[PDB]
Symmetry: C3
Subunit: 178 residues, 3 copies
């Protein structure tokens, strides 16, 4: 069954994108707004990736989900967030330990850290960064009027990892699968 072997090999080489020499690593930051809309920023880079952005509004950001590709080393993830005197602030937190595996068919398709913002916030500025396990970054942003639209028009056609409000997992298991 060479057809079957070829199918597995082809899918495996696609999971193998997580062991690239070129060290590809992606991060997505999702901002969940009070009108139900979702703003997404995606950066893809090599070796390390981070995003630094502010999310303003009278629909205000209510929650953040950060998702990293499975090539990230979770132990290197750092996050800083702001608008409490700066001069008594923590400069960052090492948030790795809070990231959960997003799994499909027992394969890790990404890592997620999700946190709600207190109602007192009309904004967050946020920087997050991670380095891959062992300049040319492209950034994408968009807004979707609902999480269902995000899922149908962005997550699903790109086969991206995701976790929705119901904690449903999205992504495609590839390692040695047909």
């Amino acid at each position: 069954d060479f057809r079957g072997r070829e199918q597995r090999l082809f899918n495996s080489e696609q999971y193998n994108y997580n062991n690239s020499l070129n060290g590809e690593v992606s991060v997505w930051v999702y901002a969940y707004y009070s009108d139900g809309s979702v703003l997404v920023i995606n950066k893809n880079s090599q070796y390390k990736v981070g995003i630094s952005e502010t999310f303003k509004a009278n629909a205000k950001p209510r929650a953040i989900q950060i998702i990293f590709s499975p090539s990230v080393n979770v132990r290197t993830i750092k996050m800083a967030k702001g608008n409490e005197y700066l001069q008594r602030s923590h400069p960052w937190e090492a948030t790795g330990i809070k990231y959960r595996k997003i799994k499909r068919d027992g394969e890790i398709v990404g890592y997620s850290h999700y946190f709600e913002l207190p109602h007192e916030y009309n904004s967050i500025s946020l920087a997050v960064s991670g380095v891959h396990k062992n300049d040319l970054a492209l950034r994408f942003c968009n807004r979707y009027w609902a999480e269902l639209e995000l899922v149908n028009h962005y997550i699903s056609p790109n086969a991206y990892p995701y976790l929705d409000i119901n904690n449903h997992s999205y992504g495609v298991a590839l390692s040695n699968r047909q």
Copy 2:
């Protein structure tokens, strides 16, 4: 008087933010416009910080003040500015020697370099950078309709270092003070 000791210790630990292991360093660039308004950009980072921005207008930028936190090593400050053939330009100036100490109660609360722009300028693009004495940067920007508003609504509630048009100094002395 343990209450007094505790007060001093608490304030000292706040000045000690200038000797952090984490190497926190801040820069503020103020742009003074012809209508009396003030635009501020603040970046806070670790180890080094720089800002690179252009200030356009029919109110035009008339002057620039750069302020660094007291953790900066003034000897590492570099600045580039533009709109004189590029191909005969200086790529940067090491401007450290022009920065004055902003002092409160004999304590350095920051370093300031201030320069007016010639009337021929309707714009400046500016990059400035400094490294601390021995990715995750958060940027903030705002505009205030007058320097008094800047002072009341930004400098004063944040206890930030500043120098106003009259050369009045702002900031809070903390090292071993109550």
Copy 3:
């Protein structure tokens, strides 16, 4: 003829900007739009320079020209471009070998890589980077309603290297010339 010697010396020192200790290197990205307009982004930096930008529209970008100053080492040029599953994408291409010398009087005044976009594209996001042969970068952008305006109002008064739609070369030869 000391006047003649001085003229040559002065022009030569201007070509010598391509052998600076300070490692000045420039890149220009031109985006040619379907209405005949031209968008330009210029970054000048030291040692390495790159630009990462997206060009959106109902006039759409139709072609890209990347020009580097003659200080770039063409062997270090890398480019990434996007909107074909990310998870089966090449992260970059080393495009150096496609860059042609722009020449004036037998002197290299820059390097050009030009490519049209397929009609299927309403956008490109693009990152390009190069390192000089052996933080403080200033970026400029503008739009011109036609390539002739670009040439008269940007290329010509700045003595910049360029290649126009007819493959006509622009720039000024300086090495040991009057």
